[PDB]
Amino acid sequence: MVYQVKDQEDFTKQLNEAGNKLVVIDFYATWCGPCKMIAPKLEELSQSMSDVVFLKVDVDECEDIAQDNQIACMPTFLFMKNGQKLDSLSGANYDKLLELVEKNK
Amino acid sequence: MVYQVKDQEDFTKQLNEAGNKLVVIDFYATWCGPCKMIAPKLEELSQSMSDVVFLKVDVDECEDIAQDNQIACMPTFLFMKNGQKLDSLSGANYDKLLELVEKNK
């Protein structure tokens, strides 16, 4: 399950509800080709890894959140734990995504 | 001055208006930091070179144009001349941008 963040309020709530778990946030746009290519693999990963929280943020609807995290390349994956940034990944590199999840879980 | 493309029809109109000139199209988003840092450099370039036309497209307002040009990284520069795509540049690399202009103007 990859929950779609509705706004800044909702974003804070989900980070709290994550508890101590690694949070992976996917910043994407519906007009971006590599976003749509990686999205199914992220959804599959989230179904298996109940120990990691997966979130996604449509930058067209949450431009404020986008602005807050200095997005550039898309998709961008942000890794967070207890509300604190651990790492960042730009682009749809599934293997690098897996290493960062492995390192930071 | 750098003209903001309003829609797909307006984009064709601006490409026609450029005539034989090189056209540099900046795809950007208002929430993107690197886009804002380089926007003033582009305006200066736009003022100073009369053999190049500079356009910009807000990807949150023309999502159709961003999808049709496979934008992935903000900002992205597209270089066109006589309706033909010549080059692309991803990111706010001003020197590469300048080089690509000198090469294609």
Numbering used by the authors:
A (entry chain B), B (entry chain A): 1 to 105
Paper text:
The determination of the crystal structures of LvTrx under different redox conditions discloses a dimeric form mediated by a disulfide bond and other residues that are involved in the dimeric interface. The LvTrx contains four cysteines; two of them are engaged to form a catalytic disulfide bond (Cys32 and Cys35); Cys62 is not involved in any interactions, but in human thioredoxin (hTrx), it has been reported that Cys62 is readily S-nitrosylated, giving a SNO modification; and Cys73, which in previous studies, showed a dimeric behavior in the crystal system of hTrx and LvTrx, mediated by the interface disulfide bond through the Cys73 residue of each monomer.
During data collection, two crystal of LvTrx were diffracted at different transmissions, referred to below as LvTrx-1x (8% of transmission, 1.33 × 10 11 photons·s−1) and LvTrx-3x (27% of transmission, 4.14 × 1011 photons·s−1). In the case of the crystal of LvTrx-3x, the structure analysis showed that the catalytic disulfide bond was disrupted at a dose of 32 MGy. The disulfide bond was stable up to a dose of 85 MGy, in which the reduction was complete. This result suggests that the maintenance of this covalent interaction could depend on the residues involved in the dimer interface of the LvTrx. The analysis of our experiments with two crystals of LvTrx show a specific radiation damage in the catalytic and the interface disulfide bond as a result of the sequential increase in the absorbed dose during the collection of each dataset. This analysis shows that the catalytic disulfide bond deterioration is less tolerant to radiation damage than the disulfide bond located in the dimeric interface with a calculated absorbed dose of 32 MGy and 85 MGy, respectively. The disruption of the interface disulfide bond opens up the possibility that the dimeric form in LvTrx is also possible in solution.
